[PDB]
């Protein structure tokens, strides 16, 4: 091969992977003070339930 092969550039090639974001996840629970207390004949049972 000819001698000007030295001057040609062979760049290193590569392989990427672009991911992105995740997921904000959510859950809630509503505890009542009016009608949950019509069950649970002990206050300790109501606090055990709320826990």
């Amino acid at each position: 091969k000819n001698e000007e092969l030295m001057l040609k550039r062979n760049y290193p090639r590569m392989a990427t992977k672009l991911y992105g974001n995740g997921i904000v996840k959510k859950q809630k629970f509503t505890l009542n003070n009016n009608d949950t207390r019509f069950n649970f004949q002990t206050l300790a049972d109501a606090t055990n339930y709320a826990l």
Binding site: I23, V24, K25, K26, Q27, F29
Partner: protein
């Protein structure tokens, strides 16, 4: 032919018997009639959408 018969031993085989369910045996109080038992059902986290 005229003597009353003589017994000499009277033995009483006596064995104490176990339960194999005795560590299970809790000691309750025995007042009231019914006993209730419950759980909390599953509730998966859901995605947040801000729209």
């Amino acid at each position: 032919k005229y003597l009353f018969p003589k017994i000499n031993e009277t033995l009483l085989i006596d064995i104490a018997l176990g339960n194999r369910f005795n560590w299970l045996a809790k000691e309750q109080d025995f007042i009231g009639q019914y006993s209730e038992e419950y759980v909390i059902m599953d509730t998966v986290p859901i995605n947040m959408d801000l729209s």
